[PDB]
Enzyme design. Structure first.
Site, PDB file in Angstrom:
ATOM      1  N   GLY A  21       0.805  -1.205   0.000  1.00 21.48           N
ATOM      2  CA  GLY A  21       0.000   0.000   0.000  1.00 21.48           C
ATOM      3  C   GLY A  21       0.840   1.257   0.000  1.00 21.48           C
ATOM      4  N   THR A  22       0.194   2.399  -0.199  1.00 25.98           N
ATOM      5  CA  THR A  22       0.831   3.712  -0.137  1.00 25.98           C
ATOM      6  C   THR A  22       2.010   3.736   0.823  1.00 25.98           C
ATOM      7  OG1 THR A  22      -0.699   5.485  -0.771  1.00 25.98           O
ATOM      8  CG2 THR A  22       0.409   5.709   1.378  1.00 25.98           C
ATOM      9  N   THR A  23       3.039   4.506   0.482  1.00 28.18           N
ATOM     10  CA  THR A  23       4.218   4.642   1.346  1.00 28.18           C
ATOM     11  C   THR A  23       4.111   5.895   2.224  1.00 28.18           C
ATOM     12  OG1 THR A  23       6.518   5.560   1.044  1.00 28.18           O
ATOM     13  CG2 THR A  23       5.452   4.723  -0.999  1.00 28.18           C
TER      14      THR A  23
END
Lengths: 200, 244, 232, 231, 243, 196, 234
Positions: free
Chosen positions: B30-32
């Site tokens: 997922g998004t960092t």
């Protein structure tokens, strides 16, 4: 588990067709490293593969010192090309390779035996501490003793100084009640073959 | 036999709860998102991916605020981030109501820790799909924490989690190396913007907005305000310069 | 429950034909109860248990054939129904009503199939002034039935036959004490019957008047009536 | 499933019990899970009422929480109503009922212990009971449970007469335990309790002559070694 | 089917598979600990392993302060350690309030082992992968060291060790109470008892320690506290200037 | 009762009488109305002995547990735990409490919790039955930042008066001094405080 | 063939980190008719294609009023929307009673996300199986949200969900800068919503019974046009 049974009930035959045989070093050093310590079942079905490959193959360096050698550069590149081909609908009859290159791949493929046994022995000492039991403790000792008999003195004399080495310097006999069998017996089978190793 | 990984409470033969390890995989995909602890506060940053052109700019906020002085950012299953931050606030307000002082960062962390850890106890509830980075300023300075689905949490000088995990963690270690005394509240913001812009090359397919918030004892008098307008461009323009 | 069958029941109904062996004989002026004791060790304390013959009230008593820990859970609740019907109507509880009260709890599991049926089969011997002396039976089926003479447990099918043979309606009480022992001639896996493999009980027309004494036999009193033939 | 718990009982340290004419005796061994551990910090022979003690074979923990639940039930269900303590027969009943419910209840496994409960009530005299995981319970003149179960049970038939003085039964239950012993054999690895005369020495007070003190006495590390020399 | 491997019920040989596995988890951290008794102190040494340079060592602790008097050190995943510590920190505050005296080391242990037991007998809850080592200087018994495990077991030790190289450490101690033939370490100041606990661990592990690889907890009468970064370096400096 | 607490340069001092009366009878003439909820956070009890006791007992806990988990408690926090109990339970309590303590930041801090359950931070606070008589003496004779023995004296006098005029107050005068250097318990006897 | 072991329920994570039971629900969206949503700076419009059963039956309603300032359209499982549209109707009507405050759109997003999330933590219950386009005019302008049953609610200028959602989703993607500037015109913003939903039809023909439209904003309270009212846009 299925496609590991498919492959085991057919290993002996692959060692023949001069094309497939190439894959067999890879597929083995892959099985050895993928030996799980949590999945009793996957492991029983891997030993199946590992012992079958050893029962019909000589663990031997077959290189005449031919310089190009190495597993990459010469085996891996070909193995991947065969697979790419096979995957895209094409069959192996349509697969054309030079009898020169395909015999480089095969000979260079017999180099990895050393770097792979260091990983099998490692995986054995990890298994000394598992509640795998009986049927499968035995079958594992067959694989270690068959692997020994299919070994030339070059490789075996290595395997020996690697059991000797790891048997003494190990951090692997903690857990309650261990499977000593998996390590003591493979020693005895070294002394069967080379009585000289006993004096010391 | 087997089947040691379909149930949540269940111990694998060598001490592992597999369902938790799977959730960590959802985190990794997922998004960092990152956090930096500076000399009098904390700075937070997140990568907002842009599915299509129709997503509205600046208007899908990912960073959540707890109480008045605490920031949370998470990577992974987003709705689980929200369910966790909600229980996070019910907790931070139980605390304030009875002990008057707003909940101390380390004590807040232990409270999330137990909610998460307690979601690893029964076959009938799945672990959180988020590693959460959070922190703020309390009676004794700044604190940055990170908390994975297993319940594990520790205090970091900096932290990352998400697709660009290994990448940010490495630029993060670079600053802790150069400046041991911590960054300045303002500098930490410029840098967090760099680090996100970089850890984006591990997801460079889609486009993205940056989002930064901070809590600084000098630059926002102890509260958790967002970074906006001129100071946001200040840093967006600093990233572009260290990407080219 | 495939063909109209009560499976989890037959399971336990035939688990009964394993443990114990019990008998009931209704005479014209009394009732008799009797049981064999489970596989005994030398060191097991004979006199204490009264393990398979339980008193329910001063006028009612049951013989058990089944799992002990399982019948105690039942009897405990039946000794109570007795006393609730006292505190409530100030008359001693009528036998059929007590029997039905249990039979209904047995069948309670024979249907709310979320908990496990009952071991145990009962012979009940009781007196109430509405229906003279009474003899009843209680399989975990839920059913109860009237009996002039009856048996439950191992070697059941066998004793029912000797009983059918030597029974007469004019029978006294002492005549029925014998018939009970006599026909634990056969139905005994232990070659030769001792006073210690036994437990006994009677509900007679009182040791005095027109009333009703109850009597669970003490070991010695058994070796005394065993004396009449059994062993001597 | 009850059957599998009886199996955890079948292994795990041996323990025994012997009723006499003027007392009861129960003992087991204290197998030290280490020499570093101080074995006096764990008691395999526990007091339930001052007239009643208990010993086990099997799963340590399941015994502890059963000894606790057991002491309490002695008050909650008897002492707080009738002012007396419960009789061996009935306190035993209330424990069987406790274990029999772990059986027939969902979501819980039965206990991994067989219990030997020994005691004296004013009306039933002495008695010794066994309680199994099944919730069944039986009255014994003497028996043993655990590994050494079969060896010792056979020795007890051979050596038991109904005219034993309590001192004779102490002597026996030491021999019986000497053949089975796994570790060393002294006062530090033997636990022995008795249910004998009233011990006024141990009441803690003096002034009402109607209550005379505990029948249950747990022999000290010393009292044991003393008997083993003249053994 | 073959599902007596997944919950806390009996295998066919009277085994609790899930507990045996739970034990295997206590090593998963790879920290070793030991505990000792003094004439009037108690000491617990644990290892501190901080691999990530991004961590803050000050927040990394497997040593918990449970009360004024009582210390606890856990071998096991951090999440489970805290679940236990928080529950003990609260069973001991409740104990003081209900009953009027501070909560005693061996009673707290019996209560967590009792807890650890329920997990061992109820289908739906899982044991914790922790081995709680409890220390104090209890007002009646003296220096105390009591350890509970996922099995529900508790017992009191002269000294003890736990974790991966547990038996290497354990066998070192055994050979030093076979030799002083007592139940403790005859030194007055706790400082020398801490030095001794670090010594006999270096000896047993065959590696040296720096002020950063150790966590020390100490219990005297009326206090249990932990040693700071520097309070340890002092202890190490003193070992090195005699050995 | 008859109690007060004063702040100064070095910390805070708590003072009280020792007379719990039921009726006209002095049931105990040596009562410890200075009660401890933490190292350096104490209270002054007044009102029902049974109510103030139960509360302080329950606060001593909340704070022992707060220490376990979260650390050392602000003097402010002790007060909040008292208010929360007193206010949320007003209908069934009769207790007026003074919480006082020393941390290092603020030094002397004092919170008075009247009957309502309200909370009021102050430099000094008086309460208890006999307080009514010294609102005059105290407002006139109190100063901020007094010296240790200046404050002991201010308390000795204030309380010498309260006891003179109140029948529900008396006994010995107990004090408790809370500073960095520790906890010091004081006592002054009648032969002393009366001659003032 | 290829079996799945981790798709049993919602309390079970796939090895790769995936909750299959949720991905399956997210697909139930596409099992219902197409609906479209878009907004200028002054209005928000919805267009849905009501689907019928026989020639002989009514058409399923696809738009539901929530308060006088907020409404939504559904594509997917009907009862799941009846259940969610109702919860929304409550919070809206509670923010009105307790605080005399029109419930923010940005906030009903946050509230549904958390409502649907609850059904993906729990053993036994299945996830929500419907998608929602939500519109409203709050104190902060026009607004549009996409609600997928995963919990992920996202704020947009336009989107489309369901059977052949892809036709419109691609029209709006190109029309963007054109329609978000349709301020102060209401009839013209609907003309656009309808010219977008009609990219997602085959040879299919909008009629008075096919079409369902709703609108809201500045000084227009949420109203719904079914039947003859919709003719003027065909």
């Amino acid at each position: 588990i299925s496609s590991l049974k498919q492959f085991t009930r057919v290993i002996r035959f692959i060692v023949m067709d001069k094309l497939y045989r190439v894959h067999i070093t890879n597929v083995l050093s892959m099985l050895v490293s993928k030996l799980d310590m949590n999945d009793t079942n996957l492991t029983s079905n891997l030993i199946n593969g590992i012992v079958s490959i050893a029962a019909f193959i000589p663990i031997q360096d077959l290189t005449g010192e031919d310089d190009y050698i190495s597993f990459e550069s010469d085996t891996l590149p070909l193995v991947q090309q065969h697979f790419y081909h096979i995957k895209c609908g094409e069959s192996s009859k349509t697969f054309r390779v030079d009898d020169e290159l395909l015999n480089n791949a095969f000979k260079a493929s017999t180099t990895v035996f050393q770097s792979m046994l260091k990983v099998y022995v490692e995986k054995i000492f990890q298994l000394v501490d598992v509640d795998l039991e009986d049927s499968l403790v035995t079958k594992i000792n067959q694989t270690t003793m068959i692997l020994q008999e299919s070994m030339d003195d070059k490789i075996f004399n290595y395997f020996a100084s690697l059991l000797n080495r790891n048997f003494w310097s190990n951090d692997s006999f903690k857990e309650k009640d261990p499977n000593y069998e998996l390590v003591t017996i493979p020693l005895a089978a070294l002394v069967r073959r080379n009585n000289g190793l006993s004096k010391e | 036999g087997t089947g040691y990984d379909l149930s949540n409470s269940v111990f694998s033969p060598d001490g592992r709860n597999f369902q938790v390890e799977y959730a960590v995989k959802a985190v990794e995909n997922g998004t960092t998102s990152i956090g930096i602890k500076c000399n009098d506060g904390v700075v937070f940053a997140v990568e907002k991916l842009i599915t299509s052109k129709l997503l509205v700019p600046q208007k899908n906020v990912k960073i959540q605020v707890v109480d008045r002085h605490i920031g949370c950012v998470y990577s992974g299953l987003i709705p689980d981030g929200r369910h966790l931050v909600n229980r996070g606030r019910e907790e931070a307000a139980s605390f304030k109501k009875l002990y008057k002082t707003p909940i101390p960062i380390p004590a807040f962390a232990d409270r999330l820790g137990q909610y998460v850890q307690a979601h690893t106890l029964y076959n009938s509830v799945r672990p959180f799909g988020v590693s959460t980075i959070f922190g703020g300023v309390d009676k004794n300075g700044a604190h940055l924490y990170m908390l994975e689905p297993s319940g594990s949490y520790w205090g970091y000088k900096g932290a990352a989690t998400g697709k660009g995990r290994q990448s940010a963690k490495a630029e993060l270690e670079k600053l802790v190396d150069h400046h041991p005394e911590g960054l300045s509240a303002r500098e930490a913001v410029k840098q967090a913007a760099k680090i996100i812009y970089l850890a984006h090359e591990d997801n460079k397919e889609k486009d993205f907005e940056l989002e930064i918030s901070w809590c600084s004892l000098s630059e926002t008098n102890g509260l958790h305000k967002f970074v906006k307008g001129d100071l946001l461009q200040e840093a967006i323009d600093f990233a572009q310069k260290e990407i080219n | 429950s495939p063909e109209g069958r009560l499976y989890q029941v037959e399971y336990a109904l035939e688990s009964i034909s394993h443990a114990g062996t019990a008998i009931g004989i209704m005479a014209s002026d009394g009732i008799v109860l009797a049981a064999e004791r489970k596989v005994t060790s030398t060191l097991l304390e004979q006199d204490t248990s009264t393990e398979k013959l339980y008193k329910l009230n001063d006028k009612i008593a049951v013989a058990v054939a089944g799992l002990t820990a399982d019948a105690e859970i039942l009897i405990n609740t039946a000794r109570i129904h007795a006393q609730n019907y006292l505190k409530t109507y100030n008359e001693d509880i009528p036998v059929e009503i007590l029997v039905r009260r249990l039979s209904d709890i047995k069948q309670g599991y024979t249907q709310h199939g979320g908990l496990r049926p009952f071991g145990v089969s009962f012979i009940y011997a009781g007196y109430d002034d509405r229906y003279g002396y009474q003899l009843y039976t209680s399989n975990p089926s839920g059913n109860y039935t009237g009996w002039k003479a009856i048996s439950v447990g191992a070697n059941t099918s066998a004793a029912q036959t000797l009983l059918q043979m030597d029974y007469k309606d004019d029978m006294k009480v002492d005549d029925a004490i014998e018939l009970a022992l006599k026909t634990l001639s056969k139905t005994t896996d232990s070659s030769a019957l001792t006073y210690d493999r036994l437990e006994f009980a009677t509900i007679r027309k009182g040791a005095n008047d027109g009333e009703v004494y109850q009597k669970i036999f003490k070991p010695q009193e058994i070796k005394d009536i065993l004396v009449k033939t059994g062993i001597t | 499933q009850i059957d599998y718990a009886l199996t955890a009982v079948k292994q795990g340290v041996t323990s025994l019990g012997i009723k006499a004419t003027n007392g009861v005796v129960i003992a087991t061994e204290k197998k030290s899970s280490s020499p570093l551990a101080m074995s006096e910090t764990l008691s395999k022979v526990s007091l339930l009422t001052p007239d009643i003690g208990a010993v086990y074979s099997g799963m340590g923990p399941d015994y502890r929480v059963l000894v606790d639940k057991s002491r309490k039930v002695a008050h909650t269900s008897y002492k707080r109503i009738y002012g007396e303590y419960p009789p061996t027969k009935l306190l035993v009943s209330e424990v069987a009922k406790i274990m029999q419910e772990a059986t027939q209840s969902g979501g819980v496994r039965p206990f991994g212990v067989s219990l030997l409960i020994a005691g004296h009530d004013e009306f039933n005299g002495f008695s010794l009971y066994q309680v199994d995981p099944s919730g069944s319970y039986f009255p014994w003149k003497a028996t043993a449970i655990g590994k050494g179960s079969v060896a010792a049970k056979t020795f007890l038939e051979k050596r038991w007469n109904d005219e034993l003085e309590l001192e004779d039964a102490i002597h026996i239950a030491l021999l019986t335990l000497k053949e089975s012993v796994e570790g060393e054999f002294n006062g530090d690895t033997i636990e022995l309790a008795i249910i004998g005369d009233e011990n006024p020495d141990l009441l803690g007070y003096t002034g009402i002559p109607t209550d005379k003190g505990p029948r249950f006495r747990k022999l000290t590390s010393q009292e044991i070694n003393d008997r083993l020399e003249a053994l | 089917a073959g599902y007596d491997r997944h919950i806390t019920i009996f295998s066919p040989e009277g085994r609790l598979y899930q507990v045996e596995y739970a034990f295997k988890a206590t090593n998963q951290t790879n920290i070793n600990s030991l505990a000792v008794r003094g004439k009037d102190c108690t000491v617990v040494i644990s290892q501190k392993k901080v691999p990530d340079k991004l961590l803050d060592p000050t927040t990394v602790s497997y040593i918990f302060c449970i009360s004024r008097t009582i210390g606890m050190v856990v071998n096991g995943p951090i999440p489970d350690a805290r679940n236990a510590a928080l529950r003990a920190k609260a069973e001991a505050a409740e104990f003081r309030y209900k009953y009027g005296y501070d909560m005693p080391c061996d009673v707290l242990a019996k209560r967590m082992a009792n807890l650890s037991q329920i997990y061992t007998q109820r289908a739906y809850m899982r044991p914790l992968g922790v081995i709680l080592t409890f220390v104090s200087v209890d007002e009646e018994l003296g220096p105390s060291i009591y350890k509970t495990d996922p099995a529900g077991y508790y017992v009191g030790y002269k000294a003890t060790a736990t974790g991966p190289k547990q038996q290497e450490i354990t066998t070192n101690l055994e050979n030093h109470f076979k030799k002083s033939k007592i139940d403790h370490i005859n030194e007055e100041s706790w400082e020398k008892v801490v030095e001794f606990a670090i010594t006999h661990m270096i000896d047993a592990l065959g590696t040296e320690f720096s002020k950063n690889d150790l966590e020390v907890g100490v219990a005297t009468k009326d206090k249990f506290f932990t040693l700071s970064a520097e309070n340890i370096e002092e202890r190490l400096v003193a070992i090195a200037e005699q050995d | 009762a008859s109690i007060m607490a004063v702040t100064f340069k070095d910390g805070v001092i708590l003072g009280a009488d020792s007379r719990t009366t039921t009726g006209a009878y002095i049931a105990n003439r040596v009562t410890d109305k200075l009660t401890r909820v933490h190292d350096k956070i104490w209270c002054c009890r007044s009102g029902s002995a049974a109510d103030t006791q139960a509360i302080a007992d329950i606060v001593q806990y909340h704070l022992e547990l707060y220490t376990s988990q979260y650390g050392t408690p602000s003097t402010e926090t002790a007060a909040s735990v008292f208010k929360e109990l007193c206010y949320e339970n007003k209908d069934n309590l009769t207790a007026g409490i003074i919480v006082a303590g020393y941390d290092d930041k603020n030094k002397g801090e004092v919170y008075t919790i009247p009957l309502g359950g309200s909370v009021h931070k102050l430099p000094y606070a008086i309460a208890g039955s006999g307080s009514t008589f010294i609102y005059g003496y105290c407002d006139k004779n109190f100063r901020e930042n007094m010296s240790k023995e200046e404050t002991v004296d201010f308390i000795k006098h204030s309380l010498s008066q309260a006891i003179k005029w109140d029948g529900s107050s008396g006994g010995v005068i107990r004090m408790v001094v809370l500073t960095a250097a520790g906890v010091e318990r004081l006592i002054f006897y009648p032969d002393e405080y009366e001659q003032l | 063939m290829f079996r799945n072991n981790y798709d049993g329920d919602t309390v079970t994570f796939s090895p790769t980190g995936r909750l299959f039971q949720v991905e399956y629900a997210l697909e139930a969206i596409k099992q219902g008719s197409v609906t479209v949503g878009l907004r200028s700076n002054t209005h928000a419009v919805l267009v849905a294609l009501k689907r019928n059963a026989d020639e002989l039956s009514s058409y399923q309603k696809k738009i539901i009023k929530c308060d006088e300032h907020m409404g939504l359209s559904l594509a997917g499982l009907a009862p799941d929307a009846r259940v969610l549209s109702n919860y929304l109707r409550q919070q809206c009507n509670y923010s009105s009673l307790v605080f005399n405050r029109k419930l923010a759109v940005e906030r009903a997003g946050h509230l549904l996300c958390d409502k649907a999330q609850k059904n993906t933590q729990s053993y036994g219950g299945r996830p929500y199986g419907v998608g929602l386009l939500i519109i409203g005019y709050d104190k902060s302008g026009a607004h549009l949200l996409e609600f997928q049953p995963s919990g992920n609610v996202t704020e947009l200028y336009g989107t489309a969900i369901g059977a052949r959602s892809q036709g419109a989703k691609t029209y709006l993607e190109r029309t963007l800068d054109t329609f978000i500037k349709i301020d102060g015109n209401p009839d013209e913003l609907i003309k656009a919503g309808v010219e977008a939903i009609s990219q997602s039809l085959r040879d299919e023909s909008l009629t008075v019974d096919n079409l369902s439209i709703a609108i809201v904003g500045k000084d227009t309270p949420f109203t719904i046009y079914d039947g003859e009212a919709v003719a003027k846009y065909i």
